[PDB]
Design an enzyme around this catalytic site. Sequence first.
Site, PDB file in Angstrom:
ATOM      1  N   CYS A  36       0.807  -1.255   0.000  1.00  0.00           N
ATOM      2  CA  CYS A  36       0.000   0.000   0.000  1.00  0.00           C
ATOM      3  C   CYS A  36       0.809   1.258   0.000  1.00  0.00           C
ATOM      4  CB  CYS A  36      -1.014   0.049   1.192  1.00  0.00           C
ATOM      5  SG  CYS A  36      -2.074   1.512   1.214  1.00  0.00           S
ATOM      6  N   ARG A  85       0.108   4.716   2.772  1.00  0.00           N
ATOM      7  CA  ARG A  85       0.210   4.454   4.222  1.00  0.00           C
ATOM      8  C   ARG A  85       0.609   5.667   5.050  1.00  0.00           C
ATOM      9  NH1 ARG A  85       4.133  -0.621   4.646  1.00  0.00           N
ATOM     10  NH2 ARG A  85       4.695   0.048   2.514  1.00  0.00           N
ATOM     11  N   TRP A 138      -9.071   6.237  -0.604  1.00  0.00           N
ATOM     12  CA  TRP A 138      -9.481   6.954  -1.784  1.00  0.00           C
ATOM     13  C   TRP A 138      -8.484   6.576  -2.914  1.00  0.00           C
ATOM     14  CZ3 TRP A 138      -8.266   9.829   2.840  1.00  0.00           C
ATOM     15  CH2 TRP A 138      -6.956  10.374   2.899  1.00  0.00           C
ATOM     16  N   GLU A 146      -4.856   3.764 -10.631  1.00  0.00           N
ATOM     17  CA  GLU A 146      -5.663   2.554 -10.471  1.00  0.00           C
ATOM     18  C   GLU A 146      -6.761   2.491 -11.521  1.00  0.00           C
ATOM     19  OE1 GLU A 146      -6.333   1.226  -6.276  1.00  0.00           O
ATOM     20  OE2 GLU A 146      -5.795   3.342  -5.652  1.00  0.00           O
TER      21      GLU A 146
HETATM   22  C1  HEM Z   1      -6.030   6.416   2.006  1.00  0.00           C
HETATM   23  C2  HEM Z   1      -5.869   6.269   0.702  1.00  0.00           C
HETATM   24  C3  HEM Z   1      -5.198   5.061   0.167  1.00  0.00           C
HETATM   25  C4  HEM Z   1      -4.495   5.006  -1.001  1.00  0.00           C
HETATM   26  C5  HEM Z   1      -4.256   6.149  -1.978  1.00  0.00           C
HETATM   27  C6  HEM Z   1      -4.034   3.655  -1.114  1.00  0.00           C
HETATM   28  C7  HEM Z   1      -3.312   3.219  -2.207  1.00  0.00           C
HETATM   29  C8  HEM Z   1      -3.172   1.881  -2.503  1.00  0.00           C
HETATM   30  C9  HEM Z   1      -2.850   1.349  -3.777  1.00  0.00           C
HETATM   31  C10 HEM Z   1      -2.613   2.164  -5.021  1.00  0.00           C
HETATM   32  C11 HEM Z   1      -2.748   0.003  -3.626  1.00  0.00           C
HETATM   33  C12 HEM Z   1      -2.428  -1.042  -4.670  1.00  0.00           C
HETATM   34  C13 HEM Z   1      -3.813  -1.471  -5.238  1.00  0.00           C
HETATM   35  C14 HEM Z   1      -3.580  -2.483  -6.347  1.00  0.00           C
HETATM   36  O1  HEM Z   1      -2.791  -2.234  -7.279  1.00  0.00           O
HETATM   37  O2  HEM Z   1      -4.178  -3.583  -6.417  1.00  0.00           O
HETATM   38  C15 HEM Z   1      -3.042  -0.301  -2.257  1.00  0.00           C
HETATM   39  C16 HEM Z   1      -3.026  -1.590  -1.748  1.00  0.00           C
HETATM   40  C17 HEM Z   1      -3.385  -1.803  -0.432  1.00  0.00           C
HETATM   41  N1  HEM Z   1      -3.812  -0.896   0.479  1.00  0.00           N
HETATM   42 FE1  HEM Z   1      -4.110   0.961   0.224  1.00  0.00          FE
HETATM   43  N2  HEM Z   1      -4.455   2.928  -0.069  1.00  0.00           N
HETATM   44  C18 HEM Z   1      -5.176   3.692   0.764  1.00  0.00           C
HETATM   45  C19 HEM Z   1      -5.826   3.316   1.954  1.00  0.00           C
HETATM   46  C20 HEM Z   1      -5.790   2.073   2.534  1.00  0.00           C
HETATM   47  C21 HEM Z   1      -6.454   1.668   3.711  1.00  0.00           C
HETATM   48  C22 HEM Z   1      -7.441   2.492   4.546  1.00  0.00           C
HETATM   49  C23 HEM Z   1      -6.031   0.372   3.945  1.00  0.00           C
HETATM   50  C24 HEM Z   1      -6.407  -0.552   5.038  1.00  0.00           C
HETATM   51  C25 HEM Z   1      -6.963  -0.033   6.160  1.00  0.00           C
HETATM   52  C26 HEM Z   1      -5.131   0.017   2.891  1.00  0.00           C
HETATM   53  C27 HEM Z   1      -4.469  -1.210   2.801  1.00  0.00           C
HETATM   54  C28 HEM Z   1      -3.978  -1.650   1.586  1.00  0.00           C
HETATM   55  C29 HEM Z   1      -3.690  -3.079   1.385  1.00  0.00           C
HETATM   56  C30 HEM Z   1      -3.811  -4.230   2.398  1.00  0.00           C
HETATM   57  C31 HEM Z   1      -3.290  -3.174   0.107  1.00  0.00           C
HETATM   58  C32 HEM Z   1      -2.853  -4.453  -0.653  1.00  0.00           C
HETATM   59  C33 HEM Z   1      -4.105  -4.923  -1.445  1.00  0.00           C
HETATM   60  C34 HEM Z   1      -3.867  -6.165  -2.271  1.00  0.00           C
HETATM   61  O3  HEM Z   1      -2.855  -6.893  -2.118  1.00  0.00           O
HETATM   62  O4  HEM Z   1      -4.711  -6.507  -3.129  1.00  0.00           O
HETATM   63  N3  HEM Z   1      -4.999   1.077   2.082  1.00  0.00           N
HETATM   64  N4  HEM Z   1      -3.278   0.866  -1.582  1.00  0.00           N
HETATM   65  F1  LIG Z   2      -1.637 -11.289  -5.504  1.00  0.00           F
HETATM   66  C1  LIG Z   2      -2.805 -11.006  -6.131  1.00  0.00           C
HETATM   67  C2  LIG Z   2      -3.255 -11.817  -7.199  1.00  0.00           C
HETATM   68  C3  LIG Z   2      -4.463 -11.507  -7.818  1.00  0.00           C
HETATM   69  C4  LIG Z   2      -5.202 -10.391  -7.392  1.00  0.00           C
HETATM   70  C5  LIG Z   2      -4.742  -9.586  -6.334  1.00  0.00           C
HETATM   71  C6  LIG Z   2      -5.519  -8.393  -5.820  1.00  0.00           C
HETATM   72  C7  LIG Z   2      -5.623  -7.249  -6.819  1.00  0.00           C
HETATM   73  C8  LIG Z   2      -6.562  -6.156  -6.269  1.00  0.00           C
HETATM   74  N1  LIG Z   2      -5.854  -5.247  -5.311  1.00  0.00           N
HETATM   75  C9  LIG Z   2      -6.817  -4.369  -4.588  1.00  0.00           C
HETATM   76  C10 LIG Z   2      -7.208  -3.227  -5.536  1.00  0.00           C
HETATM   77  C11 LIG Z   2      -8.011  -2.142  -4.842  1.00  0.00           C
HETATM   78  C12 LIG Z   2      -9.304  -1.825  -5.247  1.00  0.00           C
HETATM   79  C13 LIG Z   2      -9.956  -0.838  -4.497  1.00  0.00           C
HETATM   80  N2  LIG Z   2      -9.336  -0.209  -3.448  1.00  0.00           N
HETATM   81  C14 LIG Z   2      -8.110  -0.549  -3.059  1.00  0.00           C
HETATM   82  N3  LIG Z   2      -7.479   0.037  -2.015  1.00  0.00           N
HETATM   83  C15 LIG Z   2      -8.076   0.852  -1.133  1.00  0.00           C
HETATM   84  C16 LIG Z   2      -7.050   1.114  -0.264  1.00  0.00           C
HETATM   85  N4  LIG Z   2      -5.891   0.465  -0.708  1.00  0.00           N
HETATM   86  C17 LIG Z   2      -6.178  -0.264  -1.811  1.00  0.00           C
HETATM   87  N5  LIG Z   2      -7.454  -1.510  -3.780  1.00  0.00           N
HETATM   88  C18 LIG Z   2      -3.544  -9.899  -5.688  1.00  0.00           C
END
Ligand code: HEM
Ligand SMILES: Fc1cccc(CCCNCCc2ccnc(-n3ccnc3)n2)c1
Lengths: 407, 411
Positions: free
Chosen positions: B108, B111, B280, B285
């Site tokens: 993420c 963060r 947000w 994305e």
């Molecule tokens: C506040 C604005 C936030 C932004 C701009 C942001 C941005 C991002 C982006 C760009 C990704 C990669 C998404 C992808 O390519 O699949 C991501 C992944 C992630 N974010 Fe955020 N994030 C935000 C908030 C949060 C919040 C509130 C949480 C949890 C409380 C969080 C936890 C994660 C986690 C666990 C991932 C990995 C998701 C996955 O493996 O599919 N993020 N974040």
């Molecule tokens: F290791 C993998 C193999 C196949 C799919 C996958 C997950 C891809 C989706 N990632 C979450 C995308 C997504 C969508 C909306 N919101 C957020 N989000 C919000 C805050 N941080 C992320 N992220 C992992």
Amino acid sequence: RFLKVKNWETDVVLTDTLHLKSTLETGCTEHICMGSIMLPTKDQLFPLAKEFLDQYYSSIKRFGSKAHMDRLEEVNKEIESTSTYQLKDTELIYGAKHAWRNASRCVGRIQWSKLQVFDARDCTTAHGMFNYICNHVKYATNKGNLRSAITIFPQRTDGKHDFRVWNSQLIRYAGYKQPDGSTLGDPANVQFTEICIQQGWKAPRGRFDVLPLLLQANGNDPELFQIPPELVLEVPIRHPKFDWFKDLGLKWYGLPAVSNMLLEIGGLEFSACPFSGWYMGTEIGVRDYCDNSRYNILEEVAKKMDLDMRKTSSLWKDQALVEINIAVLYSFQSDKVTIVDHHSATESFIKHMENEYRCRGGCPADWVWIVPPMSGSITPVFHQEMLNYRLTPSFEYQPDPWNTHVW
Amino acid sequence: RFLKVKNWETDVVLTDTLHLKSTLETGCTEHICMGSIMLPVRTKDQLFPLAKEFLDQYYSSIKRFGSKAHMDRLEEVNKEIESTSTYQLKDTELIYGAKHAWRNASRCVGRIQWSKLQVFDARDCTTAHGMFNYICNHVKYATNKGNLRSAITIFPQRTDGKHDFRVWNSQLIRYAGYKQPDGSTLGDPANVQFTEICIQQGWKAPRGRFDVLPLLLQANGNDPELFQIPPELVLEVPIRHPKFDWFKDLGLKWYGLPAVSNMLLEIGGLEFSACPFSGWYMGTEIGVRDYCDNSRYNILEEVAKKMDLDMRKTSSLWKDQALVEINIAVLYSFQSDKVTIVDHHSATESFIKHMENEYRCRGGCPADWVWIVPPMSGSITPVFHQEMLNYRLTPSFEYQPDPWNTHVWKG
Ligand code: HEM
Ligand SMILES: Fc1cccc(CCCNCCc2ccnc(-n3ccnc3)n2)c1
Ligand code: HEM
Ligand SMILES: Fc1cccc(CCCNCCc2ccnc(-n3ccnc3)n2)c1
Ligand SMILES: C[C@H](O)[C@H](O)[C@H]1CNc2nc(N)[nH]c(=O)c2N1
Ligand SMILES: C[C@H](O)[C@H](O)[C@H]1CNc2nc(N)[nH]c(=O)c2N1
Ligand SMILES: [Zn+2]
């Protein structure tokens, strides 16, 4: 033990088994991934020779042959006796092609088997090296129609008698600090430029001054030589839509030629082994031109485009980056100098991954270096899982010679 | 053992000691790096150490380590485990837990915001209708009429693994995908399978290109049920471009609330299998992945045509050119409608300041470079140039299998 790699855009899955031949270590552990870190005696030598010879003889379908056994026998005799050994030309050529084949950070490896190898193991002096190098430059440049090559200088002996090219590439532009505080030319090379000057070079103190060669034979102090200008093919950068683009006064060189690496074949080390292929456009247009600590031209260009440079969210940097890169390609194409775009290059590498998985059981690849520094996810390598691991023969890094050299 | 990471643009070297606290494994070994591989019923036995380690961290963070309050809590958890086999978190611990899972999420980029996170405790929830109510409230609260607020809603924890709460949607808000008999897909190709399950389960599908999916909710190990998010709670943004007037005529929109609903939250050894969270969007994305991935809406062709770029050779960079335009369009549309969004320049730059701050106060920041670097314009963002160390800390967000692969149907 047998690992899968999936392409997430196409669902294609490949099984890697080649990695179980891996030898050297990665820098990772099960607790920690170092994937993004840039740099993570007789008794040793014979196992290394054996493993190399075994793969050579297997590649020519004479594994377990008298000739195979004779050769291990003879090499072993020679190590025991002389404590090093000499490669047959055929082993040398095979070794070189395979070091390239194994280079996990090189996207251009579909070409790995069409490499011209120049044997410079008879070289003894820096003039001799200069001569070999110019021949390499002229052969590879080929009037714009570039051809891959490597020139191999003598191997390390006691490490007191090393051959080294002090330049990081055969062809780069110089770097000078102004009283001004800014930097004229390539800031990457400001130090190497200083070493040239303190060694004798008369710099013209321009923005795009081809650097001299600094060549060290047999562990002597290195010596200066200017590549005949007529062998250095350069390309003026213009844009096919923006007339003012040409007034920026940019040019790049046609020949990309890495000269600071160490080539390891069957335990032997070739500390001077300059090699060259041809450019993927982004190397120049994204990295050389737009890196902050390089020519860093994005601001000047966005200006000339009259973009809204007030907020990052207009994507003015992004817009200018694309234009610059269009120009690079356009210029090299218009002047008939071989160049490849990141779309074509990565698509070919995917095809090479396929061939390698099928005919060899895998292909070591470094995702962090293979995905182009622009437009990542619109190239197919972005969506391709890659396994990174170290196979030999290899190219390796080695300390900058100025830090090791005993003057 | 101290580990150094270097930024090759600025020469800033940082020192990581935090990776010493890392327990779980990476997928890598000394012989193979798996840094680009996407994916490289607990007993009393394993559970108390995990609780202990967590509560030690919680008590440290509150400057109460070793206190009588600290010792009584360990004590109480210990007896709760041996007697009931699990245990319950205090609200304060759950909050600290959820925040730290985000803090530790190395994929993420968002963060810098980790400490501002609204945690909704839904541990008293018992039914699917109960879940729907919780989820509506989260969406309304997070959306905040465009002024987005990070939130997370935490459903009851796993007990025997036979009574799990699950949100079957991958995100709370996503568009339907439909495979056509001619092989083409209408709407989002990533959601064809899940769309099919919704249909089977009784959803009347409108069959358009942007149909908000129904919620498919599973409480207490029971068969899941369908609910339609009130449309007035679903904030959407029509996509137009500041210079190009035909852009609106592509008929693109996107929703404003990005909300991950399929991860598992681990805290002190407890597993929260339904824990939807939302922040947000970073522009890319939507503008890079959602719109231009070949296996998603894939608008590159149609966009470039309308721009009349030379399309007969990849070396025109026609693809790169359409890609920037679309991304300007997305950011423009959101800013104009006052819906929070962040561009990839702003986001990565903030991430680098976060990451630096984290080394100075915490001794590290686990980070996954492959995911952190944006999918357009990589090296003109400061993250490309940053070395990063990736390792697993708990509390954490983990993947879990898709519930349709594992669910035992009741009928
Ligand atoms: C506040 C604005 C936030 C932004 C701009 C942001 C941005 C991002 C982006 C760009 C990704 C990669 C998404 C992808 O390519 O699949 C991501 C992944 C992630 N974010 Fe955020 N994030 C935000 C908030 C949060 C919040 C509130 C949480 C949890 C409380 C969080 C936890 C994660 C986690 C666990 C991932 C990995 C998701 C996955 O493996 O599919 N993020 N974040
Ligand atoms: F290791 C993998 C193999 C196949 C799919 C996958 C997950 C891809 C989706 N990632 C979450 C995308 C997504 C969508 C909306 N919101 C957020 N989000 C919000 C805050 N941080 C992320 N992220 C992992
Ligand atoms: C034929 C055209 C070739 C193309 C398009 C190409 C492409 C590239 C690219 C883009 C890189 C990354 C450079 C960087 O980001 O610093 C690279 C690195 C490399 N290539 Fe090539 N290559 C070609 C030929 C060769 C040849 C002929 C060899 C050796 C015989 C070679 C060996 C390597 C090695 C060892 C690296 C890693 C260099 C380093 O770590 O700094 N390549 N290649
Ligand atoms: F890990 C590192 C830390 C600091 C510098 C570094 C080397 C970056 C330069 N790589 C070579 C660039 C380059 C230039 C011309 N030509 C090629 N080239 C030609 C064929 N294949 C590559 N490559 C690594
Ligand atoms: C920190 C990071 O490893 C570093 O910036 C890398 C990223 N990817 C790269 N990729 C290539 N091809 N060349 C590079 O120099 C780099 N630099
Ligand atoms: C194979 C590869 O790891 C995969 O495409 C990853 C690459 N980097 C990514 N980075 C982000 N942020 N999101 C992703 O889905 C991916 N996909
Ligand atoms: Zn690794």
